[PDB]
Amino acid sequence: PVLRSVNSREPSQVIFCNRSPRVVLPVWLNFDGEPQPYPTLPPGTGRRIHSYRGHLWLFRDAGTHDGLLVNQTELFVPSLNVDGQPIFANITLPVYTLKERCLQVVRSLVKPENYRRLDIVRSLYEDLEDHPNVQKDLERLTQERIAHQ
Amino acid sequence: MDVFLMIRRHKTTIFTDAKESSTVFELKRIVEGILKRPPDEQRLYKDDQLLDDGKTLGECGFTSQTARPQAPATVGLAFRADDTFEALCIEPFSSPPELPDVMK
Amino acid sequence: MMYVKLISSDGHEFIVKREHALTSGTIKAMLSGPNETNEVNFREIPSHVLSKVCMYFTYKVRYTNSSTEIPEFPIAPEIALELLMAANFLDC
Amino acid sequence: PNPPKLTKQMNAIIDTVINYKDSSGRQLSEVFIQLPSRKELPEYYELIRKPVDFKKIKERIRNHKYRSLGDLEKDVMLLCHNAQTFNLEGSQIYEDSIVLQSVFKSARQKIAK
Ligand SMILES: Cc1ncsc1-c1ccc(CNC(=O)[C@@H]2C[C@@H](O)CN2C(=O)[C@@H](NC(=O)C2(F)CC2)C(C)(C)C)c(OCCCN2CCC(c3ccc4c(c3)n(C3CCCC3)c3nc(=O)c5c(Br)cccc5n43)CC2)c1
């Protein structure tokens, strides 16, 4: 797998800093590229955590799995600890498209079973049902990384 | 510091940004460039109160906390109509329909 | 700066920076082929929805490429479906 | 309290197992040092009736709970069997416990010579 943690033995202290209004789910990509859910971060909180250089992390809304950014990007990799200092992983909301933001709100208000009882254009039902998922986003990111290489 | 504004007259709304340190007159100059009416032919309001030309936007009450891009502050605009300033009039936007039952 | 006029189904006129309106591919397509030069009319987008769309163009322009904590774009339950319909049409 | 020669042997064997590094330089004992908490992984405590880790083993040498090399062997064999019970065959951790079990046997032979 292209997106996976490197089996490194280099310890790396990180500050997971939740600068978003959501409950954050940190996701560690294991050595076999499989996503591993870690303890959640309430909004406006930070935790000093133990990781390794070369380890791959993703951040999602814990409740919905909506995508979040870390240091203005999708993946976080602990790197060089300058003069002992822990690495800061600033977790924030992306500037979502209006469509994706609307989908989020409609999803929070309607049960999936009731999506097709809404009076909207047919393709919007498909978008409502295309729930945000770690595995889905990984597949897209894998293609994105392969195209660069 | 940037302030995000809705300048409203009747059925017209101008969406614009400005500096907190910028003045009412500079904002009247932005209105002139768009609606082709000189500053003296305009009256600007923050709710019921008429804003003075010299006063900064921050002095009027427009701060980053209240004039947000996703929630702009309303600046009322009145023009001199039939040789005299018309009463301040802003037409309301439409009303959202009854919320769907599956959304209830 | 250039300005464009976006007109709601109920005749409300929203004057926004050309740059903000070009966020939408649909708006771009209707500013390059249809009454005036930089005026676009939306026959099915009401003023309570169009106003929120203009707020969204502002929010997007301000918060894209910025080192600041990004606030949530708020959307009231009552405008949620109609805002979804327009955002879909507009591709925003 | 145990005789001083016995305590030295126990620590020498356990240090060999813990400081064991494979071909890649990876310390196989690393994940086995500390058990997962009962809060984070309650299934582990529902499945494994006698949980042990290398910190618990070190503490049992130190407090003279093991009165022989056989007593120490039983706990290392229990840690490895636990690892082999909870985790799937072929997983890194399952495989690491197989190697640690072998390293223990060799280290006990060396000290007995
Ligand atoms: C607080 C907070 N808020 C937001 S994020 C957060 C937070 C942040 C950090 C931590 C701790 N840090 C890590 O988990 C880091 C992160 C990422 O970089 C990978 N990682 C590791 O440490 C990995 N290790 C290594 O790469 C190396 F050490 C070899 C170099 C490892 C997962 C494979 C262990 C945290 O940890 C809490 C949850 C993390 N889990 C890590 C694995 C743990 C574990 C520990 C001991 C185990 C074990 C599993 N398993 C299995 C394997 C998985 C299923 C259970 C197992 N089976 C056994 O049978 C056994 C026995 Br016999 C004896 C002793 C331990 C044993 N263990 C359980 C907790 C919470």
Author numbering:
A (entry chain B): 61 to 209
B (entry chain D): 1 to 104
C (entry chain C): 16 to 49, 55 to 112
D (entry chain A): -2 to 110
Publication passage describing the model:
We aimed to achieve orally bioavailable molecules that selectively degrade the BAF Chromatin Remodelling complex ATPase SMARCA2 over its closely related paralogue SMARCA4, to allow in vivo evaluation of the synthetic lethality concept of SMARCA2 dependency in SMARCA4-deficient cancers. The synthetic lethality between SMARCA2 and SMARCA4, resulting in sensitivity of SMARCA4-deficient cells to loss of SMARCA2, has been discovered and validated by genetic methods, but pharmacological validation and exploitation of this synthetic lethal relationship has been hampered by the lack of suitably selective small molecules, in particular for effective in vivo use in animal models.
We previously reported potent dual degraders of SMARCA2/4, utilising a phenolic exit vector from the VHL ligand, and hypothesised that PROTACs based on our ligand compound 3 would offer additional opportunities for in vivo degrader optimisation. Notably, compound 5 demonstrated partial degradation of SMARCA2 (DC50 = 78 nM, Dmax = 46%) while sparing SMARCA4 completely. Kinetic experiments demonstrated that compound 5 did not show degradation of SMARCA2 at 4 h, suggesting a slow rate of degradation. We have previously shown that E3 Ligase: PROTAC: POI ternary complex stability can impact the rate of degradation. Whilst the position of SMARCA2BD may be influenced by crystal contacts formed in the closely packed crystal lattice, the structure indicates a de novo protein-protein interaction (PPI) between Asn67 of VHL and Gln1469 of SMARCA2. It is noteworthy that SMARCA4 features a leucine residue in this position and is thus less capable of forming such a PPI, offering a possible rationale for the observed selectivity of compound 5.
